[PDB]
């Protein structure tokens, strides 16, 4: 058969294994100068050559250790497993791929520690009063979600430097608000006050002893406090096996990196812990503010979830920051911090409702494609995250690892870890390129022309100059030829104008900035189409002029991504069910729908138009769609409840759907989707 294995290779086991994953090799001495050594296994097996000598490595994945997912959480922290399997070994032949599956569970009763980092500007004096008994209120609302809760407290104002602070009169250094006829603490950068403890009564005691301070400029040094809280693991008291919440309450803009030039501070902020025995930020006055990139690195490294409990006037500013800091949630805070307790509980529920995988230390020779099963059993392709989960739900992701050629490292390992999870999957990849026949290698064998070339794997790999099957034809001694197969067909150029027609075989040229290979020196690895100045878009390897796109990418130019994470819309459906996903971008096939995720449409059917069947699917369970799984797969609303007919606060879709019974089903749609379906419609 004219397969790729027989056309290329046919020189050594080492070269043919790299031709393609399906190629094999026969080292048996049978078939003298007959069928090619390299071909599909059945082709080689069919033509004899099967003395169990075929070298056909197969990529395999083995689970070195996989403890079952713990179902209860709490109990013994060391035994709480949220990712299964925990370690897997991959053996990939050259340019081969192997698929492997993992499971992630949001275990119930998982320990959580909440660290409260409150801005203490003078405008936060009202806020500090309502927090007075937040420790006990927070404990009562969390004991129904977690057995192990620990809460800490920290405060920040700004850098105690010449600007941002009042340095005159001398009394202002001790009572900054003295010009307003009031008493306040001297300004501080960051002040850790209460380490994470289970005794919630300690939180109430510490907040009652706190006080506010007054600075000059509106922006606060909040990001300085966030960095110290994240990196001071020992001081703060984070637990490795627990959900790390960092509630960041503020009501003003925040200083960013390079703002320290105003104070004369030019040293970049290194992500180090500078909180001393006095629990104060030592480097507050000598180190610049952290950048957004640095904070994300440390937040991701420490597995800390950041909550922006900000007020209305800066909700958009921190929402836009949250875009540049993945893994953060923004909650609107009252001007007196009267709803912080509900803000934290909602934030925690939102954090535990999503699972997103991240890859760390991925070798450049490997690529990964992730498929998400999420809730129900729909395998959304090219998605590494599942949203809408509740505590106890398990999601499975199928990942395929493809290697770019044959790396020489032979031992690499990367970690696949969900965001915010201590647990992770350690993947050990061991590349397998050379064959077992190479062990029995003869550097100078009498078979290969009285040992002028090396013999191994049943063929002769001749040295320089000497060529041929047995290294007996030399290089220039056979310039004339009579059985030469240099030309692929009669009348065609000899060796495709890229080689020398000596001793029948076509010896390819030096192959500058590339490598010319093939029976007629037609293949190469420098002729593939360059999309943006890179061959195969730098997302693929050139194989005989064809871009062999690795996993995670596809297309002739290997520029169309298989990632569909962009499509995923707040709605929970790829590109809001109003269109498909083409290379990340959404194609809004739905008429009148547009946007980045085809989520906004003002001229589509109203909620009632379809939500009527959503209630008929569950509230009635009649007509249709009840056997189509739409009531659960599609209908995330609630079943028949009541008709308050007063819930117009947000999302008030009044629907008087008419049922088959003629009753006027008055249901109201109400950003968790909730359907206030009438208990019983009136016919």
């Amino acid at each position: 058969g004219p397969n790729i294995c027989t056309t290329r290779g046919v020189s050594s086991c080492q070269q043919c294994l790299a031709v393609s994953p399906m190629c094999a090799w026969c080292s048996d001495e049978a078939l003298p100068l007959g069928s090619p050594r390299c071909d599909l296994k059945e082709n080689l097996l069919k033509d004899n050559c099967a003395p169990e000598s075929i070298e056909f490595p197969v990529s395999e994945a083995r689970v070195l250790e996989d403890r079952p997912l713990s179902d209860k959480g709490s109990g013994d922290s060391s035994q709480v497993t949220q990712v299964s399997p925990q370690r897997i070994a991959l053996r990939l032949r050259p340019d081969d791929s192997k698929n492997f599956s993992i499971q992630v569970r949001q275990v119930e009763d998982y320990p959580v520690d909440i660290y409260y980092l409150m801005d203490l500007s003078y405008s936060m004096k009202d806020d500090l009063w309502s927090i007075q008994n937040l420790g006990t209120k927070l404990a009562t609302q969390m004991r129904k979600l977690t057995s192990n809760l620990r809460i800490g407290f920290g405060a920040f104002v700004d850098k105690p430097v010449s600007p941002y602070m009042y340095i005159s009169p001398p009394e202002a250094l001790e009572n900054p608000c003295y010009d307003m006829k009031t008493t306040c603490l001297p300004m501080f950068g960051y002040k850790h006050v209460l380490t994470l403890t289970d005794q919630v009564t300690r939180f109430n005691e510490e907040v009652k002893k706190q006080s506010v301070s007054r600075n000059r400029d509106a922006p606060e040094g909040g990001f300085d406090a966030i960095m110290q809280a994240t990196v001071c693991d020992e001081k703060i008291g984070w637990r490795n096996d627990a959900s790390h919440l960092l509630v960041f309450t503020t009501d003003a803009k925040t200083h960013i990196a390079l703002d320290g030039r105003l104070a004369g501070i030019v040293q970049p902020n290194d992500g180090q812990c500078h909180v001393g025995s006095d629990n104060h930020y030592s480097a507050s006055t000598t180190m610049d503010y952290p950048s957004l990139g640095l904070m994300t690195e440390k937040l991701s490294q420490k597995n800390i979830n950041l909550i922006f409990a900000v007020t209305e006037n800066v909700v958009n500013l921190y929402q836009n920051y949250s875009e540049l800091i993945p893994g953060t949630t923004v909650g609107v805070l009252s001007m007196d911090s009267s709803n912080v307790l509900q803000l934290i509980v909602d934030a925690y529920g939102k954090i535990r409702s999503k699972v997103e995988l991240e890859v760390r230390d991925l070798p450049e020779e490997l690529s990964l494609s992730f498929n998400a099963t999420c809730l129900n059993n729909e395998v959304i392709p090219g998605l590494k995250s599942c949203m809408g989960l509740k505590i106890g739900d398990t999601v499975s992701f199928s990942i395929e690892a493809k290697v770019r050629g044959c790396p020489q490292e032979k031992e690499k390992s990367f970690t696949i870890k969900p965001v915010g999870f201590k647990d992770s999957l350690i993947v050990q990849v061991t590349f397998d390129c050379d064959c077992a026949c190479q062990a029995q290698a003869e550097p100078n064998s009498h078979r290969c022309n009285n040992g002028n070339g090396t013999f191994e794997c049943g063929v002769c790999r001749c040295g320089p100059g000497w060529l041929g099957s047995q290294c007996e034809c030399s290089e220039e001694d056979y310039r004339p030829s009579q059985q030469d197969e240099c030309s692929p067909r009669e009348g065609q150029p000899v060796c495709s104008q890229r080689g020398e027609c000596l001793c029948g075989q076509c010896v390819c040229h030096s192959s500058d900035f590339g490598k010319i290979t093939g029976k007629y020196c037609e293949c190469d690895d420098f002729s593939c189409v360059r999309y943006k100045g890179e061959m195969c878009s730098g997302h693929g390897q050139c194989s005989c002029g064809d871009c062999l796109c690795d996993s995670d990418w596809t297309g002739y130019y290997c520029n169309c991504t298989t990632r569909t994470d962009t499509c995923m819309s707040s709605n929970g459906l790829l590109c809001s069910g109003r269109g498909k996903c083409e290379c990340g971008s959404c194609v809004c096939i739905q008429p009148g729908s547009y946007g980045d995720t085809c989520e906004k449409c003002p001229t589509c059917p109203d909620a009632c138009t379809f939500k009527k069947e959503c209630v008929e699917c569950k509230k009635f369970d009649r007509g249709a769609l009840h056997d189509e799984n739409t009531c659960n797969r599609y209908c995330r609303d609630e079943i028949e409840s009541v008709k308050e007919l007063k819930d117009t606060g947000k999302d008030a879709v009044n629907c008087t759907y008419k049922n088959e019974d003629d009753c006027v089903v008055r249901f109201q749609y109400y950003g968790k989707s909730i359907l206030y379906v009438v208990e019983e419609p009136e016919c």
Binding site: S121, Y122, R214, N215, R216, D217, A218, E220
Partner: peptide, 4 residues
């Protein structure tokens, strides 16, 4: 008018 302006500041903290």
């Amino acid at each position: 008018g302006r500041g903290d």
